[PDB]
Amino acid sequence: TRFERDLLVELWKAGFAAIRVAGSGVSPFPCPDIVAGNGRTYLAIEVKMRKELPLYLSADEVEQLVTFARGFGAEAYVALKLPRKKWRFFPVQMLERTEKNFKIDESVYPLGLEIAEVAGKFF
Amino acid sequence: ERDLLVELWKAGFAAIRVASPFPCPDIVAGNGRTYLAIEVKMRKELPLYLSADEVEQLVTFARGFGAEAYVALKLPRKKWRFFPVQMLERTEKNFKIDESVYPLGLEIAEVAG
Ligand SMILES: [Cl-]
Ligand SMILES: [Cl-]
DSSP: OHHHHHHHHHHHHTTOEEEEBTTSTTSSSOOOSEEEEOSSOEEEEEEEEOSSSOEEEOHHHHHHHHHHHHHHTOEEEEEEEOTTSOOEEEEGGGSEEETTEEEEOTTTGGGOBOHHHHHHTTO | OHHHHHHHHHTTOEEEEBOOOSOOOSEEEEOSSOEEEEEEEEOSSSOEEEEHHHHHHHHHHHHHHTOEEEEEEEOTTSOOEEEEGGGSEEOSSEEEEOTTTGGGOBOHHHHHO
């Protein structure tokens, strides 16, 4: 949750108004960790910090994120922070489907976007 | 405010409560077409007073996010009512929803469509 706050700062710096979601996992409704918007692009973000790859994500967590994004009208992203690395943003298409769940390993991580690119995608 | 979340989802909005250095509303909602940034108030009776800072912060967030800024007000025995900021009565240094403003309030159905 310390890390969710750091990402908020980076999002605001990149031109997004962003909020952390109160009780993401503690609620009945699909929930991301952060929701952000800049008037054109809207983001539903699951926020993860790991000491090393790979990041594993359950099918359920990704399904929930995608369902929320569809209902809200936002793009679904996983934001992953590793030590000594800037935040990297993975559209859900970029997640590897494997063993009935999802993963970001060494073959996927380098393709993750920096926050500036997420904004520019619209154009 | 959790009752409000349920009302928003029932009306077809995906809505979250907001958990600070930056401007932020109480609830943000969207249905793909309309996005809402909502300050949530529950009161026993009118008027409701809102500070200029609170309304300014709500409008700034709404402008930055790409949402419509609303105050949602719940009174006992009444359905939730939604007020765009331009509905608010401007007093000397504050904003207000009194008996004359309250009738203008939208119900959730109208906000969506
Ligand atoms: Cl984490
Ligand atoms: Cl990097």
